[PDB]
Design a binder for this molecule. Structure first.
Ligand SMILES: [Mg+2]
Ligand SMILES: [Mg+2]
Length: 400
């Protein structure tokens, strides 16, 4: 009925325009940063423009949603706070408004009086984008607003966003780094069961015209509310570009030859645990930056599995992506719990859940995915991968 999802799409686009604008409006390009932000527990307010563009994007989505579905805005949680410390040590509460006491006047206090940088940004946070399909007269679903909580990651991969590389070549379709790794993640889960229901991934930086220098981006979405529904898989990678431009070509990675001979695996820049088994089916493991980008590789079919072994992924990083993945048959299951309860001794209960915190132990790092994750799109592919049998893995040709 009134889709919260079509709105999450216009608004993720409005977040992407801010994310691009800070690189495109010449003046804004200039306020970059210096250090890797997170001495997190004791209030660690470290890198100034990064955190400003972050808080701003979280705020624009919170408020444009407050403004279209009243009541929603208090159920929108995320990684950023909506407060920044400025130069002088003053804590500033970021409210733009709708019809506003100028966002300009608010940004001036964070930007030391910078009337120019203030106005470049307030202009783009208030530009109205119209962005509208594919679930218009099609997936007319109603979900009771009282059961819905939202997890936002405003600009995922801040290192890559800040390093700014526009020129990296992808190994096999997977970008190891670059602006292509940055995503806007907006996940919607069920407050009582914890289960992701709907998701929007927007990559702001997909194609750049090198003559014109402008970037175009792609937006992906899914919904699993007993009906399961998804974005026509499609980024301009495998469509217009040298491929499905004839009639109905749908047999590229997203549809690729069912299953049988090889695992493709993506892992982070810093991943330090293992690898699978070559003469069984492969050892195509790729490094790729972006927690949301690596999930997107699994969604798109470029990778089969995404494994992250440490505790440094959080709910905002996985929720949007886990929901699109559920709408296609996949999910995200906790890593340590699979490594303990060998897979089928109690089945889909180690799917990540997003309503509960972890013991209130770390205080502030209440919302981490503790013993890592494995994101997958086919449970058959997941059941193959986990079969790395210690004490019997030297038969590298596991018939079963
Ligand atoms: Mg971020
Ligand atoms: Mg993040």
């Amino acid at each position: 009925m009134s889709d919260i999802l079509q709105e999450l799409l216009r608004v993720s686009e409005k977040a992407a325009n801010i994310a691009r604008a800070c690189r495109q409006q010449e003046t804004l390009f200039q306020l970059l940063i210096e250090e890797k932000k997170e001495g997190e527990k004791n209030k660690k307010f470290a890198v100034d423009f990064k955190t400003l563009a972050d808080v701003l994007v979280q705020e624009v989505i919170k408020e444009n949603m407050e403004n279209k579905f009243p009541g929603l805005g208090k159920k929108i949680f995320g990684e950023e706070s909506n407060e920044l410390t400025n130069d002088l040590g003053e804590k500033i509460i970021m409210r733009l408004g709708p019809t506003e006491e100028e966002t300009v006047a608010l940004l001036s206090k964070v930007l030391n009086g910078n009337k120019l940088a203030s106005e470049a940004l307030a202009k783009v946070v208030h530009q109205d984008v119209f962005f509208s399909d594919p679930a218009l007269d099609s997936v007319e679903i109603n979900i009771p607003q009282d059961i819905l909580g939202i997890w936002v990651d405003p600009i995922d991969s801040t290192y890559q966003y800040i390093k700014g590389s526009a020129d990296i070549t992808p190994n096999q379709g997977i970008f190891p780094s670059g602006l292509q790794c940055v995503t806007v993640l907006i996940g919607v889960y069920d407050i009582q069961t914890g289960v992701p229901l709907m998701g929007v991934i927007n990559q702001p930086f997909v194609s750049q015209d090198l003559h014109t220098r402008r970037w175009k981006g792609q937006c992906y979405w899914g919904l699993s509310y007993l009906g399961t529904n998804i974005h026509s898989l499609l980024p301009p990678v495998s469509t217009r570009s040298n491929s499905e431009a004839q009639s109905q070509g749908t047999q590229n990675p997203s549809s690729e030859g069912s299953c049988r001979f090889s695992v493709v695996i993506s892992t982070s820049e810093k991943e330090t645990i293992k690898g699978a088994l070559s003469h069984v089916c492969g050892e195509r493991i790729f490094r790729a930056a972006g927690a949301g980008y690596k999930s997107l590789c699994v969604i798109l079919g470029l990778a089969d599995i995404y494994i992250f072994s440490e505790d440094t992924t959080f709910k905002w990083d996985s929720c949007a992506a886990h929901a699109i993945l559920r709408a296609m048959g996949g999910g995200m299951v906790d890593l340590k719990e699979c490594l303990e309860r060998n897979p089928d001794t109690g089945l889909d209960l180690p799917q990540l859940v997003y309503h509960v915190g972890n013991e209130g132990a770390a205080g502030v790092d209440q919302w981490a995915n503790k013993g890592g994750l494995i994101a997958y799109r086919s449970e058959k592919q997941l059941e193959t991968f986990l079969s790395r049998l210690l004490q019997h893995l030297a038969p590298v040709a596991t018939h079963t």
